[PDB]
Every structure is written in structure tokens, then in C-alpha cells.
Amino acid sequence: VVGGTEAQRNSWPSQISLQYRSGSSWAHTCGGTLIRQNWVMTAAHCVDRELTFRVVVGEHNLNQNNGTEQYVGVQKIVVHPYWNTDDVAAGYDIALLRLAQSVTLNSYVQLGVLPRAGTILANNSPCYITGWGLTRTNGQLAQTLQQAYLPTVDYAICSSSSYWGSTVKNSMVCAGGDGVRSGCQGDSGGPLHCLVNGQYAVHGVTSFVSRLGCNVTRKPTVFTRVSAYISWINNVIASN
Numbered sequence: 408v409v410g411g412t413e414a415q416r417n418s419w420p421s422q423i424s425l426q427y428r429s430g431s432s433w434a435h436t437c438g439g440t441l442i443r444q445n446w447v448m449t450a451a452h453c454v455d456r457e458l459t460f461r462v463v464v465g466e467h468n469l470n471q472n473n474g475t476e477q478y479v480g481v482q483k484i485v486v487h488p489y490w491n492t493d494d495v496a497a498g499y500d501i502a503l504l505r506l507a508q509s510v511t512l513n514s515y516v517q518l519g520v521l522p523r524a525g526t527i528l529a530n531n532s533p534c535y536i537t538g539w540g541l542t543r544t545n546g547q548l549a550q551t552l553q554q555a556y557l558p559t560v561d562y563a564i565c566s567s568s569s570y571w572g573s574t575v576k577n578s579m580v581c582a583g584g585d586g587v588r589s590g591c592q593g594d595s596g597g598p599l600h601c602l603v604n605g606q607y608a609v610h611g612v613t614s615f616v617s618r619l620g621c622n623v624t625r626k627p628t629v630f631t632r633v634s635a636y637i638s639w640i641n642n643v644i645a646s647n
């Protein structure tokens with residue numbers, strides 16, 4: 408997350424690390440949201456390479472033992488049927504991972520809350536992006552879960568010539584845009600948390616930044632808008 412602040416051990420407890428095995432060891436690739444005791448929403452894009460993956464729930468500091476981590480292997484990766492790998496801009500950038508075990512719920516390991524279907528955030532909705540991704544353009548991944556305040560820019564503004572143009576769809580949330588904060592590489596798959604009737608609901612799954620850099624003026628961070636995809640989620644969990 409560029410322009411972030413270390414989050415607390417328990418501010419965002421649906422946040423998981425997707426890790427892939429790296430010869431001898433595991434490595435952070437992407438984030439995700441634990442949506443059932445054994446199901447993690449992430450990006451289709453994260454799980455695009457043929458690599459062995461584990462999920463880590465209870466993670467705050469990657470590099471150090473927190474006393475709270477549960478490591479569980481990914482059993483099944485269900486990508487959106489319509490996702491084309493060579494076109495993020497078509498949308499559909501979402502995958503559900505069934506975990507080999509169901510994980511223990513406790514203060515560090517909770518279910519993320521999903522929006523209702525159809526739900527569109529209003530231009531300016533208070534939202535937080537959370538992740539271990541790069542803290543600079545061409546920089547380095549964070550040791551400790553970070554957050555940045557990332558307020559929504561709606562379809563109309565986001566699809567003008569000045570901001571994104573046709574690259575962004577209404578299947579999509581663009582939060583941010585201010586030159587200072589946004590997502591960046593390694594936050595992908597992660598949750599956008601936005602405040603709705605006293606709850607933090609997950610409204611986006613982190614998709615893309617400009618080819619040019621993470622924190623770029625008039626290029627918000629783009630997230631798969633979860634409320635579009637609710638029935639697909641429910642169906643994949645119901646039949647699998």
C-alpha cells in the first residue's frame with residue numbers, strides 16, 4: 408500500500424496472506440478475504456501461475472512469529488469463468504479458494520462481511536485499503552500489515568477521459584487517486600473495507616494500478632466491486 412500506516416493486530420481480521428512456495432520457503436504474493444471458515448476470496452489474477460499456495464490467517468508481521476498465525480494449504484482454486492488473463496480491463500478479476508482445513512475463529516481470525524448485491528458506493532465513501540504490498544513504486548513489500556485511507560471515485564468520474572476512460576467498468580470500484588495513496592503490487596486480491604450502517608463491509612478485491620506507478624494523480628486504484636459478484640460467490644460455495 409503506498410502512503411500507508413501500520414494497522415493494528417486486530418483492526419482487519421478477515422485479511423489473509425496468499426503465499427506461494429518458493430523452493431525452500433514461502434513467499435507473499437497477494438492478499439485476500441476469508442469469507443467462510445474454509446473459503447478465501449482473492450483475485451483470479453493472483454492464482455494465475457501454476458505455483459503451490461498456502462493461506463495464512465492471523466498474520467500481522469510476515470517475517471516474524473506473532474503467536475496468532477494459522478497456515479492452511481489451498482485445496483481448490485475456482486476462478487471466474489469469464490476472466491481473461493490478458494485483459495484486466497474486461498473485469499471479472501476474482502477467484503474463490505477452498506482451504507484444506509476450516510480455520511479456528513478467534514480475535515485475529517474472523518469472517519469478512521460481504522455487501523448486498525447491487526450496492527453502489529457514493530462518490531466519496533470512506534474506505535480503507537489493507538495489505539503487505541509495495542510501499543513505494545518499484546519499492547519493497549511491507550513487513551507489517553498496512554492501511555491507507557482510500558475514498559471512492561464513482562463510475563462517471565472514473566470513466567472520464569481525465570481519469571481512467573473506458574478501462575474502468577461499472578463492475579469496478581476505483582478508490583483513491585490523489586498522488587499520495589493507493590494500492591500497489593502485492594496488495595492484489597486484498598480487501599477494500601468501507602463503512603456501511605456501522606459495519607466494515609468488503610466492497611472491492613484489489614485489481615490494478617496504472618502501468619506507470621502506484622500512487623498516480625487521477626489514476627485511482629481499481630477493485631473488482633464485490634456486490635456485482637455475490638450470486639456467483641454464493642453458487643460456487645453452495646456447489647463445490
Ligand SMILES: CC(C)C[C@H](NC(=O)C(F)(F)F)C(=O)N[C@@H](C)C(=O)Nc1ccc(C(F)(F)F)cc1
Pocket residue numbers: 452494495496540574590591592593594595596613614615616617618619628
Ligand atoms: C495487471 C495486473 C497484474 C495487476 C497489477 N495490480 C497491482 O499491482 C495491484 F495490487 F495494485 F492491484 C498492476 O496494476 N500492475 C501494473 C504495472 C499494470 O500492468 N497496470 C495495468 C495493466 C493493464 C492496464 C490496461 F487494462 F489498461 F491494459 C492498465 C494498467
Ligand SMILES: [Ca+2]
Pocket residue numbers: 467468469470471472473476
Ligand atoms: Ca509472521
